[PDB]
Design an enzyme around this catalytic site. Structure first.
Site, PDB file in Angstrom:
ATOM      1  N   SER A  28      19.505 -56.838 -19.771  1.00  0.00           N
ATOM      2  CA  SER A  28      20.020 -57.987 -19.025  1.00  0.00           C
ATOM      3  C   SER A  28      19.376 -59.193 -19.662  1.00  0.00           C
ATOM      4  O   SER A  28      18.164 -59.446 -19.496  1.00  0.00           O
ATOM      5  CB  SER A  28      19.658 -57.917 -17.535  1.00  0.00           C
ATOM      6  N   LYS A  70      29.202 -59.973 -18.247  1.00  0.00           N
ATOM      7  CA  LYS A  70      28.363 -59.221 -17.360  1.00  0.00           C
ATOM      8  C   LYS A  70      27.875 -60.079 -16.189  1.00  0.00           C
ATOM      9  O   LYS A  70      27.757 -59.573 -15.090  1.00  0.00           O
ATOM     10  CB  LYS A  70      27.225 -58.576 -18.129  1.00  0.00           C
ATOM     11  CG  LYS A  70      26.235 -57.807 -17.282  1.00  0.00           C
ATOM     12  CD  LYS A  70      26.826 -56.571 -16.652  1.00  0.00           C
ATOM     13  CE  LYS A  70      25.722 -55.782 -15.962  1.00  0.00           C
ATOM     14  NZ  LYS A  70      26.250 -54.588 -15.330  1.00  0.00           N
ATOM     15  N   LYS A 112      18.393 -61.950  -8.926  1.00  0.00           N
ATOM     16  CA  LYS A 112      18.214 -62.366 -10.319  1.00  0.00           C
ATOM     17  C   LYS A 112      19.537 -62.628 -11.041  1.00  0.00           C
ATOM     18  O   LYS A 112      19.639 -63.631 -11.797  1.00  0.00           O
ATOM     19  CB  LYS A 112      17.339 -61.364 -11.107  1.00  0.00           C
TER      20      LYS A 112
END
Lengths: 288, 285
Positions: free
Chosen positions: B92, B166, B234
């Site tokens: 990520s 994403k 997050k």
């Protein structure tokens, strides 16, 4: 075993495909409605059209309302004497979008008169209607719902959700999810695109993962193709949001997500978007 | 033919890799996972750089941008990588982080593709993840046999565009979660049984993967972590930060970062991402 004579009151959004599966299942159909060409299309299928709704309803085993809202339903049932004229033992199916408070109120009056009521809204749009793969969310008594079920199966899969007004309530839950998912999909597709991504590929990439939904595949493709021609108008979704919020304040529920979405939809109808499709919320969020 | 994993969903993915005929090398932080991989035939290395050396394709499954920089530039993976090779980042990381890594490795002759993933542990065991890739078309083409093993890959754009897709992906997931959660609570306050509303709902316009997976968990009040509520928060913040680098106004996502923040403050940091239900249910007594 309970029903052969069916009446429609109004044709709403999917009335025509539903009448045709109905005749195809060998039900006899009476109709009262306000629109000549639909009337003709229905007459072509075998349906008998009446000028007065009371006349359409009187000999029915099951009367199905596909009317617009609560006021119209009230007027037709009582101002126009539909309720007065229905058989004993007959059933009234309300498919109109109508507040659960209104559904319970209509269920009480008709019951006053020996007439059963279920509230049976649908999700699934035009091809569920044509394919008999609607989803139907029913409120009322188990015995009445079983009486209903054979008629219901013709239109799709029906689920008994609770007592009077429960169907409308499940209906407003389903419109909240549709109304919010629309905005989630417009916002993520725009984000991707400002970021130099191209909407079509992104949609193609997230298809079949955790982000996948009936809203992404249906409304999202319309977002990709800037095709905002109305199937269910933007202002209908606004009304669904408003009814959900009115219901929330009456049952003591705090709904911030839907609160944000009512504002966003309200901010769309002003700005002249009333007549775009529900996916037209993209337009509201693009301009920003 | 020769694959390396940097870090480890990685266990079921390596299973599939190894069955599918690839040779595997690993550098791992967790001994039990290294054990399992050892069991499948993977050779486990002590140093990231030694596991990366001879690889055709190095797949990073590190936590974040800091860690991937650390691992690449500080511990010498980049310096140690082969002349032809390819780095696939599934970590990520921001699209900015990924544009930057693409360029530093590009100056060393290393190809780079950002390939994050959507799907469950169930997607990874069954090979049906969905893969979102940014980077050069010929690179993508080189990677495809490999990505095919994990699932179905779509080339979305240049470097940085897998991570973009994403964040877009995680925006929808996170908002759908509250949408489903709020709708199920609304119906329940209104008298309705939650299981029954989800039963009624399924199959029409409101159906989604979120309803089917997270909604089942909400219905059963089963909020044990599969992806933690910390990570979803997050995600929103990454998304809002990128939103701002690109000049984007996201008021929905902005509201959900809020709701997820209030959740994390109220103790719920280590519930599943479906745990936002617990927050919206507290607000409502």
């Amino acid at each position: 075993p309970y029903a052969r004579k069916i009446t429609f009151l109004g044709t709403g959004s999917m009335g025509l495909p539903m009448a045709r599966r109905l005749c195809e299942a060998g039900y006899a159909l009476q109709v009262w409605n306000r629109t000549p060409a639909r009337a003709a299309s229905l007459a072509a299928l075998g349906a008998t059209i009446h000028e007065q709704a009371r006349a359409a309803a009187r000999d029915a085993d099951i009367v199905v309302s596909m009317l617009e809202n609560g006021a119209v339903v009230q007027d037709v049932l009582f101002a126009q004497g539909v309720a007065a004229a229905m058989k004993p033992g007959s059933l009234f199916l309300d498919m109109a979008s109508i507040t659960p408070r209104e559904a319970r109120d209509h269920a009480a009056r008709l019951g006053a008169l020996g007439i059963a009521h279920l509230d049976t809204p649908v999700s699934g749009g035009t091809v569920g209607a044509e394919q008999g793969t609607l989803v139907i969310m029913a409120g009322g008594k188990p015995a009445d719902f079983e009486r209903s079920l054979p008629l219901l199966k013709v239109f799709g899969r029906a689920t008994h959700v609770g007592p009077h007004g429960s169907g409308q309530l499940t209906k407003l839950a389903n419109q909240m999810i549709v109304g919010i998912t629309i905005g989630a999909v417009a916002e993520a597709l725009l984000f991707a695109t400002k970021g130099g991504a191209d909407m079509a590929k992104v949609k193609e990439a997230i298809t079949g993962g955790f982000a996948d939904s009936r809203v992404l595949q249906l409304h999202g493709q319309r977002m990709v193709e800037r095709d905002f021609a109305p199937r269910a108008r933007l202002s209908i979704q606004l009304k669904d949001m408003r009814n959900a919020l009115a219901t929330a304040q009456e049952i003591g529920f705090d709904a911030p997500i839907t609160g944000l979405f009512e504002q966003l939809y309200a901010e769309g109808v002003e700005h002249g978007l009333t007549d775009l499709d529900q996916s037209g919320l993209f337009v509201e969020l693009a301009s920003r």
